RNA sequence: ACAC
């Protein structure tokens, strides 16, 4: 999957471009396309998936646009919402037993890798059997507190 | 709330 596109949600009515511009430059993160702003939501490309994970890393639930906290995720159409997932903000010196023992409470784990990251939190891709365990993974694990760490977890392209 |  093509994972440099961004989705940017939580905006507020009247989110603008120039907003979503200035928090970018700030964060020191470079876009390769203009911002699509809708309603409530917009969409950016970044030059490649490094960038887009710093982004994601950066300004999810962090930075704000008059106020509103801004969601920062990859971007991914809902007929590709199946069976990946992409996990964040893990503790940096965990061991894979402790992550395997809550990622198998909700199916089984064809794969995982971990993703090459600046950060000293860990990142992970993982893939489940089927749409249905992916979605109770991300409804149970997204949020989870877990060595003072709060995991963050989201979908990613499913082929 | 993922692009008439």
Redesign the pocket.
């Known amino acids: 999957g093509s994972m440099n596109?961004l989705?940017i949600?939580?905006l507020s009515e009247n989110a603008a471009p120039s907003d979503l511009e200035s928090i970018f430059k700030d964060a020191k993160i470079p876009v390769s396309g203009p911002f699509?702003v809708?309603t409530?939501?917009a969409?950016v490309?970044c030059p490649d998936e490094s960038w887009a994970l710093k982004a994601i890393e950066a300004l999810s639930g962090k930075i704000e646009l008059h106020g509103k906290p801004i969601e920062v995720?990859?971007?991914?159409?809902?007929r590709q919402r199946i069976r990946k997932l992409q996990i964040r903000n893990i503790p940096p010196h965990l061991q894979w037993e402790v992550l395997d023992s809550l990622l198998v409470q909700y199916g089984v784990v064809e794969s995982c890798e971990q993703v090459n990251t600046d950060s000293e939190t860990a990142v992970v891709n993982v893939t489940y059997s089927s749409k249905d365990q992916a979605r109770q993974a991300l409804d149970k694990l997204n949020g989870f507190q877990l060595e003072n760490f709060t995991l963050k977890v989201?979908?990613i392209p499913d082929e």
């Open positions: 596109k989705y949600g939580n699509l809708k409530g939501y969409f490309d995720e990859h971007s991914v159409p809902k989201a979908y």
